């Protein structure tokens, strides 16, 4: 059922967990560095878990997709073929930016954070800068112990702040990936859908120095020896059985003004979906002629497809549940209830008014803001602007450098510059530049940016072509040139005749002004947000509803049971899919082109010792009433005894609007069964070394 | 489960019946004029049943649709509005061809029929004429008692013959029909589909003379008083409950040569559907501008839509189960089996080669044969050929007149000419004549018909124009001219300058010779069919498989349980639909435009004492594993104690290929719950008088 519960809420879910079927004590779950919770790790936007004492990590194929793609070429395409390392020496690097974060400690810092903020006084921009400096100091102190990365989280609109400290493993290697047609069976057609038949798993191994301490990739590194790791279930998972997930959901918007919802549904989602579909269509068309573009843009294209389809689904779910109407009546109720409370309610009512105004302020420039951000997110302009900004930040003392441009960020920035080699083709990027220039030109006069208008020097197809022709002379196309500029100083950027550098120099003052504006709004939000969201929480509690913070990339627990759902009268979706349903979807063409060893093994009914009698087959995926979102991909699903029975990977079509308005009847997790991981690794793309190492 | 069982097979199915849940004794089901089987009646291509001691008969809406359509105009549309007669004096005639047949006696006459067949040559034609003669004399003797009609039936390819004797009620009146948006909710979109939400019901009353003998419509007639009628269940029907149907399935082809299947799959079904779709497109156009053409062509349209969709379904179901493969493979295996026992398996093997040749013979002219038959089925040419042929037969002694043209056929002949008034518009028929001439002209030259070539004046657009212009001259467009010719002698037809009559007089010698060719082809069939079919049966028995005769318009029993089915892995269709499901499909446009009163009753949860707790609503339609086919519409569904729980009306989409190859996993009846009939009559389109009459 509902709720992305923080660990600190365990006392409150202890009873519900037992009722649902958990056989572990709640204290055993409350030990976040113990067994089994200490086996759960963060990857930075996906979750994973250890599954051997020698550092083996399991997650979704779509989480490892970036790493598989970085190790792929047109001629040797691991996305297509899978990957398998017979020995740990055969493992390939997942890329310099790949990470496994192992939870060490969580600290409440709410009192100190709120004091740092209060000490700024009336000024919105100061209040932002106070919170920044507080965070920077806190994180510098916490990261004084080498090998650790820390993160500060704000919960419930700034009513609670906690600090997380994590061991930061920085040498992550790819150990195994099934073929693409298993890992992404059904592709974008089955994305966000049930029935689902997708073997969405992959394995990493985590490495540290011979001295035990995190290091970047080196052949002298050796496997990390985790304190705790998961075991595979020895009891067959069935319909109605208890399941629980712990992971790192990224963002929800369940506490939101009706106006924030209205702008999202009416403008944000449709606009983004359209832009992403336009880019898909260009890249798709060009990748058909050019297998180098197809392999280099594949991870980008996966993200665009997934987000744009998610947004289409949210819009449809909003209509199905009348989310607009719900948000309007709920807000009417909360404001009523507040007015109800005399003077005691006034601070929340005023905070509501301030939040509404700040939404209006961001709305006035939304087209400009989005269009400029995505234009500058093309590969050369993004490299130019990032690196120019770094050169500026490098002239301030580290403590005053903008988050993302501090010494602690330099490894990521450098890694990003190298990884781009596997993700960029000039003739492809050119067409994306051109799309965004043509979108820019459609902006009305008050959403335009002088610096870009002057650089374009024209408002028509010829000016667009001249600009593209100019940018095409950049040298930032090569990794070596990007790294040169990574180390160069500000005056060197300002002297350059590289046309992408020249663009970054021309626009940077405007970028910095826009950033100050966003910080100013954020500072006003810091004043109003906690007070209104505390009112929302108090109101929900007075109605007997579940109260838990919106997702914010920190560790949450959700629990419930294996069950289907009923999309329309006269039909039900069953909790499981089976091997035969995979074969039934076979067409021999992408995305429905399973490995021939799969087709043969199912035809021959080789169930590998993994058959569940109750469904007559090996299970493939299943549905459950857990409450997950983006960031939970790769989260282990645990049974009543804390054993691994699957990995979370998706939500069904109707679930996705639950980001804004939770619907219990149609909100389900889609998970890949542990038995299907094992079956694939037995019968289809064998990895007998890994099954051995997992004691199966 | 599988089986359209003859009542004589009751001993075989007694134990199966008990195991499935029948609580009546098998010998009570055996009493075909007892309780409840004696309440089941035949309408002629639909079933129905008695539901009060005053002659009330319930059947489907689409079985009553002819009658409703006959009593409808543009300016009073009963199809749209429904019909309710508050007293029996208000009931309108169903039309002169409408019948209720009440079963009186079955007789085996197999020995006699086979002797009479044998007694003929060894000439094929004489064999047909000898069976014809034998049937005619049986029927003449059986019909000698005023008020009865009799039928001879051949079962299992001519291994058994039984004679049925029926009371023939000839005055049938409409008592109630719900509005078309209930009776045909979902129209042709939901036709042949589940989930289904269609209230497919209507009521007649049966009338006899004041002496209690059958008579044609008159205001002196009085309600028939049936010896047995059905009672509504008092136990709620739920999932897994026992159900059974008795009724009159028309045709199955489950005993068939593989090439029979192939020709049907590859030629017959595709061709007929194509033709039917083309006529639909034409009539649909002309009726959207023309309310009179729309109403008058409504029943014809419904028929074309329904068969063409059925055939589209049968083709898809063939591909889904590889019907062609399964047929080929089964035929191999029974050919195998037969040579198999050499000496004694020799008559059967011979038979197969005959049947196969006969089929190649049909095949030679099949395009000619279809095109000619359908061309002559247009309204004016059909009337003129039928009427001229009647003039020719009337010159022979009645015992030698062709079946369909004897004294006993005159009522239905005369009736059809009158009913044609409600189904004919000259502008529309012209377009249909055009359509079929166009199709005739493109016959390949060896499949032309000499007389029609001549009648036409060679074959191009010009001749077609002239054809049509000429036939427009007919006076057969009026009921009265048609009846004038119903009485006229043969030389009066040959004298006529009516252009439609002149077509018939021109073409008849050909039609008679073609008929002779068919009777000859059939006679040869009469030899080989019973022997080869009896071997198909013998082989099924030896494989433990179920053995029952293909359907033949005679009374059959099917039994099983209420259950869903699973079209694809990860989903199931539930056994019931509910009121809420009807409202979810609402669009306010045809065909999803329920009565305001239904929409309001469902919004209000006014379930009228009819809610079934297990599904949380009033049931609408339900699925079960009974084995029904065309002719079974209107058949009453009975529960374990012989109470009415439903009417059969359709099959799910994947069921329909079971006409050729029975698939138990996807073959379900779709029925309308007796609770929904009651609910509609309480809350939506009320008929308190009929509810009181049925003791509910
Ligand atoms: Zn452990
Ligand atoms: Zn470096
Ligand atoms: Zn088994
Ligand atoms: Zn008459
Ligand atoms: Zn109730």
CSV table of N, CA and C in Angstrom, one decimal, chain A residues 228-284:
chain,number,residue,atom,x,y,z
A,228,UNK,N,27.3,-6.9,4.5
A,228,UNK,CA,26.1,-7.6,4.3
A,228,UNK,C,25.7,-7.8,2.9
A,229,UNK,N,25.1,-8.9,2.6
A,229,UNK,CA,24.6,-9.2,1.2
A,229,UNK,C,23.3,-9.9,1.2
A,230,UNK,N,22.5,-9.8,0.2
A,230,UNK,CA,21.3,-10.5,0.1
A,230,UNK,C,21.4,-12.0,-0.3
A,231,UNK,N,20.5,-12.8,0.3
A,231,UNK,CA,20.3,-14.1,-0.3
A,231,UNK,C,19.1,-14.4,-1.1
A,232,UNK,N,19.1,-15.2,-2.1
A,232,UNK,CA,17.9,-15.6,-2.9
A,232,UNK,C,17.0,-16.4,-2.0
A,233,UNK,N,15.7,-16.1,-2.2
A,233,UNK,CA,14.7,-16.9,-1.5
A,233,UNK,C,14.8,-18.4,-1.8
A,234,UNK,N,14.5,-19.2,-0.8
A,234,UNK,CA,14.4,-20.6,-0.9
A,234,UNK,C,12.9,-21.0,-0.9
A,235,UNK,N,12.0,-20.0,-0.7
A,235,UNK,CA,10.5,-20.3,-0.8
A,235,UNK,C,10.0,-19.6,-2.0
A,236,UNK,N,9.1,-20.3,-2.7
A,236,UNK,CA,8.5,-19.8,-4.0
A,236,UNK,C,7.5,-18.7,-3.7
A,237,UNK,N,7.7,-17.6,-4.4
A,237,UNK,CA,6.8,-16.4,-4.2
A,237,UNK,C,5.6,-16.6,-4.9
A,238,UNK,N,4.5,-16.4,-4.2
A,238,UNK,CA,3.1,-16.5,-4.8
A,238,UNK,C,2.2,-15.4,-4.6
A,239,UNK,N,1.1,-15.4,-5.2
A,239,UNK,CA,0.1,-14.4,-5.1
A,239,UNK,C,-0.4,-14.2,-3.7
A,240,UNK,N,-0.5,-13.0,-3.3
A,240,UNK,CA,-0.8,-12.5,-1.9
A,240,UNK,C,0.3,-12.5,-0.9
A,241,UNK,N,1.5,-13.0,-1.3
A,241,UNK,CA,2.7,-13.1,-0.4
A,241,UNK,C,3.2,-11.7,-0.1
A,242,UNK,N,3.7,-11.5,1.2
A,242,UNK,CA,4.4,-10.2,1.6
A,242,UNK,C,5.6,-9.9,0.7
A,243,UNK,N,5.7,-8.7,0.3
A,243,UNK,CA,7.0,-8.2,-0.2
A,243,UNK,C,7.3,-6.7,0.3
A,244,UNK,N,8.6,-6.4,0.3
A,244,UNK,CA,9.0,-5.1,0.8
A,244,UNK,C,10.2,-4.7,-0.1
A,245,UNK,N,10.4,-3.4,-0.3
A,245,UNK,CA,11.4,-2.8,-1.1
A,245,UNK,C,12.0,-1.7,-0.2
A,246,UNK,N,13.3,-1.6,-0.3
A,246,UNK,CA,14.0,-0.4,0.2
A,246,UNK,C,14.8,0.1,-0.9
A,247,UNK,N,14.8,1.4,-1.1
A,247,UNK,CA,15.6,2.0,-2.2
A,247,UNK,C,15.6,3.5,-2.1
A,248,UNK,N,15.8,4.2,-3.2
A,248,UNK,CA,16.1,5.6,-3.2
A,248,UNK,C,15.2,6.3,-4.2
A,249,UNK,N,13.9,6.4,-3.9
A,249,UNK,CA,13.0,7.1,-4.9
A,249,UNK,C,13.4,8.6,-5.0
A,250,UNK,N,13.3,9.2,-6.2
A,250,UNK,CA,14.0,10.4,-6.5
A,250,UNK,C,13.1,11.6,-6.1
A,251,UNK,N,11.9,11.6,-6.7
A,251,UNK,CA,11.0,12.8,-6.5
A,251,UNK,C,9.5,12.5,-6.7
A,252,UNK,N,8.7,12.9,-5.7
A,252,UNK,CA,7.2,12.9,-5.9
A,252,UNK,C,6.7,14.3,-5.6
A,253,UNK,N,5.4,14.5,-6.0
A,253,UNK,CA,4.8,15.8,-5.9
A,253,UNK,C,3.4,15.8,-5.2
A,254,UNK,N,3.3,14.9,-4.3
A,254,UNK,CA,2.0,14.7,-3.6
A,254,UNK,C,1.6,15.9,-2.7
A,255,UNK,N,2.5,16.6,-2.3
A,255,UNK,CA,2.3,17.9,-1.5
A,255,UNK,C,2.6,19.0,-2.5
A,256,UNK,N,1.6,19.6,-3.0
A,256,UNK,CA,1.8,20.5,-4.1
A,256,UNK,C,0.6,21.4,-4.1
A,257,UNK,N,0.8,22.7,-4.4
A,257,UNK,CA,-0.4,23.6,-4.7
A,257,UNK,C,-1.2,23.1,-5.9
A,258,UNK,N,-2.5,23.3,-5.9
A,258,UNK,CA,-3.2,23.0,-7.1
A,258,UNK,C,-2.7,23.7,-8.3
A,259,UNK,N,-2.2,24.9,-8.2
A,259,UNK,CA,-1.6,25.6,-9.3
A,259,UNK,C,-0.3,25.0,-9.8
A,260,UNK,N,0.5,24.4,-9.0
A,260,UNK,CA,1.7,23.7,-9.4
A,260,UNK,C,1.2,22.5,-10.3
A,261,UNK,N,0.2,21.8,-9.8
A,261,UNK,CA,-0.3,20.7,-10.6
A,261,UNK,C,-0.9,21.2,-11.9
A,262,UNK,N,-1.6,22.3,-11.9
A,262,UNK,CA,-2.2,22.7,-13.1
A,262,UNK,C,-1.2,23.1,-14.1
A,263,UNK,N,-0.2,23.8,-13.7
A,263,UNK,CA,0.9,24.2,-14.7
A,263,UNK,C,1.7,23.0,-15.2
A,264,UNK,N,1.9,22.0,-14.4
A,264,UNK,CA,2.5,20.8,-14.8
A,264,UNK,C,1.7,20.0,-15.9
A,265,UNK,N,0.4,19.8,-15.7
A,265,UNK,CA,-0.4,19.1,-16.5
A,265,UNK,C,-0.7,19.8,-17.8
A,266,UNK,N,-0.8,21.2,-17.7
A,266,UNK,CA,-1.2,22.0,-18.8
A,266,UNK,C,-0.1,22.5,-19.7
A,267,UNK,N,1.1,22.6,-19.1
A,267,UNK,CA,2.2,23.1,-19.8
A,267,UNK,C,3.5,22.3,-19.7
A,268,UNK,N,3.9,22.0,-18.5
A,268,UNK,CA,5.3,21.3,-18.3
A,268,UNK,C,5.4,19.9,-19.1
A,269,UNK,N,4.5,19.0,-18.8
A,269,UNK,CA,4.4,17.7,-19.4
A,269,UNK,C,4.2,17.7,-20.8
A,270,UNK,N,3.1,18.4,-21.3
A,270,UNK,CA,3.0,18.4,-22.8
A,270,UNK,C,4.2,19.0,-23.5
A,271,UNK,N,4.7,20.1,-23.0
A,271,UNK,CA,5.8,20.8,-23.7
A,271,UNK,C,7.0,19.9,-23.8
A,272,UNK,N,7.4,19.3,-22.6
A,272,UNK,CA,8.6,18.4,-22.6
A,272,UNK,C,8.4,17.1,-23.5
A,273,UNK,N,7.2,16.5,-23.4
A,273,UNK,CA,6.9,15.4,-24.2
A,273,UNK,C,7.1,15.7,-25.6
A,274,UNK,N,6.5,16.8,-26.1
A,274,UNK,CA,6.7,17.2,-27.5
A,274,UNK,C,8.1,17.3,-27.9
A,275,UNK,N,8.9,18.0,-27.1
A,275,UNK,CA,10.3,18.3,-27.5
A,275,UNK,C,11.1,16.9,-27.5
A,276,UNK,N,10.8,16.1,-26.6
A,276,UNK,CA,11.5,14.8,-26.5
A,276,UNK,C,11.0,13.9,-27.7
A,277,UNK,N,9.8,13.9,-28.1
A,277,UNK,CA,9.3,13.2,-29.2
A,277,UNK,C,9.9,13.7,-30.6
A,278,UNK,N,10.1,15.0,-30.7
A,278,UNK,CA,10.8,15.6,-31.9
A,278,UNK,C,12.2,15.2,-32.0
A,279,UNK,N,12.9,15.2,-30.9
A,279,UNK,CA,14.3,14.8,-30.9
A,279,UNK,C,14.5,13.3,-31.1
A,280,UNK,N,13.6,12.5,-30.5
A,280,UNK,CA,13.5,11.0,-30.8
A,280,UNK,C,13.4,10.8,-32.3
A,281,UNK,N,12.5,11.5,-33.0
A,281,UNK,CA,12.2,11.2,-34.3
A,281,UNK,C,13.4,11.5,-35.2
A,282,UNK,N,14.2,12.6,-34.9
A,282,UNK,CA,15.4,12.9,-35.7
A,282,UNK,C,16.5,11.9,-35.5
A,283,UNK,N,16.7,11.5,-34.2
A,283,UNK,CA,17.8,10.6,-33.9
A,283,UNK,C,17.5,9.2,-34.4
A,284,UNK,N,16.3,8.7,-34.3
A,284,UNK,CA,15.8,7.5,-34.9
A,284,UNK,C,16.1,7.4,-36.4
